[PDB]
Amino acid sequence: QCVKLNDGHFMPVLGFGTYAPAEVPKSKALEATKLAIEAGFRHIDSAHLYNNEEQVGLAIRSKIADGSVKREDIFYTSKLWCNSHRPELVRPALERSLKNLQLDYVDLYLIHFPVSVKPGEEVIPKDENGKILFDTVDLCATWEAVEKCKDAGLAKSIGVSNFNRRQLEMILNKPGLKYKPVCNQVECHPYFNQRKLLDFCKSKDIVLVAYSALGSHREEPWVDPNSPVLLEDPVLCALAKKHKRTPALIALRYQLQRGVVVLAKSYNEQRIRQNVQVFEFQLTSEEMKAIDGLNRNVRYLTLDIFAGPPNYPFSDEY
Numbered sequence: 514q515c516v517k518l519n520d521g522h523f524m525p526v527l528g529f530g531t532y533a534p535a536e537v538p539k540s541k542a543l544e545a546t547k548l549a550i551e552a553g554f555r556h557i558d559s560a561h562l563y564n565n566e567e568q569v570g571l572a573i574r575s576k577i578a579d580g581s582v583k584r585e586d587i588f589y590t591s592k593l594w595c596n597s598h599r600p601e602l603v604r605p606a607l608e609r610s611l612k613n614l615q616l617d618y619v620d621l622y623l624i625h626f627p628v629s630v631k632p633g634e635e636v637i638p639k640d641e642n643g644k645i646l647f648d649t650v651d652l653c654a655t656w657e658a659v660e661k662c663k664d665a666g667l668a669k670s671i672g673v674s675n676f677n678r679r680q681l682e683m684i685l686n687k688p689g690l691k692y693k694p695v696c697n698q699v700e701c702h703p704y705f706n707q708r709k710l711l712d713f714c715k716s717k718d719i720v721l722v723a724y725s726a727l728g729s730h731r732e733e734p735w736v737d738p739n740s741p742v743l744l745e746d747p748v749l750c751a752l753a754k755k756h757k758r759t760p761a762l763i764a765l766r767y768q769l770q771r772g773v774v775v776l777a778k779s780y781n782e783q784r785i786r787q788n789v790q791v792f793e794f795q796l797t798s799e800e801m802k803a804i805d806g807l808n809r810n811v812r813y814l815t816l817d818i819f820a821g822p823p824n825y826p827f828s829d830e831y
């Protein structure tokens with residue numbers, strides 16, 4: 514099942530997440546990505562940050578060479594990291610992802626986070642006291658370089674991630690904009706359902722792509738270990754039993770029925786094969802409303818290490 518983007522291109526509504534916590538060997542990304550394609554995932558997500566571009570690329574190209582899928586059947590996303598916001602650094606960053614993937618183009622390229630950091634190899638550059646070295650870049654300038662990647666054919670569609678309403682409006686209202694973002698990829702699940710943001714994106718022809726839809730990796734110290742665990746939620750568990758399925762499949766189906774494109778990461782073969790079954794059942798309107806009731810302002814990935822700078826996206830209401 515696919516959604517038509519404001520760019521004419523299509524995006525599978527179920528996506529395979531590929532981030533894993535630093536402690537997971539990079540070899541794991543390889544087999545898990547192969548498993549996902551085999552189970553039926555067609556839309557995979559990755560970015561320079563994840564240090565996995567090479568493995569995911571190996572996996573996808575294996576699946577294309579064995580004949581399982583054609584390149585046009587795969588929807589592959591990449592993301593421009595905070596250290597390459599500067600306009601003249603955007604194309605090299607994308608081209609570097611491409612060389613690592615061994616692919617000639619990505620289906621989707623996102624500005625990964627609206628706060629910039631010092632250019633260089635280090636993804637989170639720090640001074641000699643451990644203090645983060647932030648950068649000052651006009652996101653409108655970043656966006657115009659992202660646009661030229663689309664003009665060059667290196668990215669089929671382009672979009673954003675972790676932008677708030679203010680920041681979406683700054684891109685939309687930029688003098689001479691060529692292409693609106695096709696999507697805003699943000700944290701979304703039953704505990705933090707982003708109704709306001711989802712409505713706003715919808716009003717502007719932007720898809721909301723929900724990350725950490727299963728309650729997140731819970732990796733420390735990015736996510737407070739004292740936060741409630743989404744998948745232990747009693748109502749998701751009751752809904753799972755009633756439909757002969759699990760709580761993860763309930764959270765995934767919820768997003769598909771409210772107009773959201775949803776990601777799901779797993780490196781476990783059983784969970785991978787299970788997650789594609791979201792298309793096999795549905796929730797009634799009263800069940801959707803029960804899930805809506807779960808919303809409790811629990812943002813798992815606060816990324817508050819990046820608070821301070823003017824573009825920190827999460828101090829605003831949405």
Ligand SMILES: NC(=O)c1ccc[n+]([C@@H]2O[C@H](COP(=O)([O-])OP(=O)(O)OC[C@H]3O[C@@H](n4cnc5c(N)ncnc54)[C@H](OP(=O)(O)O)[C@@H]3O)[C@@H](O)[C@H]2O)c1
Pocket residue numbers: 529530531532533558559625674675698699723724725726727728729730731744759761762776777778779780781784785787788814
């Ligand atoms: N743009 C951004 O800034 C941003 C931020 C966060 C995430 N993302 C993207 O979104 C993807 C997913 O988010 P996330 O990585 O936080 O993970 P998630 O999709 O919310 O899943 C979290 C955990 O749920 C487990 N899980 C998966 N299927 C399950 C099932 N059927 N039953 C029980 N547990 C299940 C996985 O562990 P197992 O592997 O052990 O199955 C995984 O660790 C990421 O990998 C990344 O691609 C983007």
Ligand SMILES: O=C(O)c1cc(-c2ccccc2)cc(Cl)c1O
Pocket residue numbers: 532562626732735814816819
């Ligand atoms: O999956 C992602 O895209 C992701 C991004 C950041 C990150 C770190 C710093 C600033 C913004 C995003 C941190 C974690 Cl733990 C993630 O899983």
Ligand SMILES: [Zn+2]
Pocket residue numbers: 756795796797800
């Ligand atoms: Zn039902």
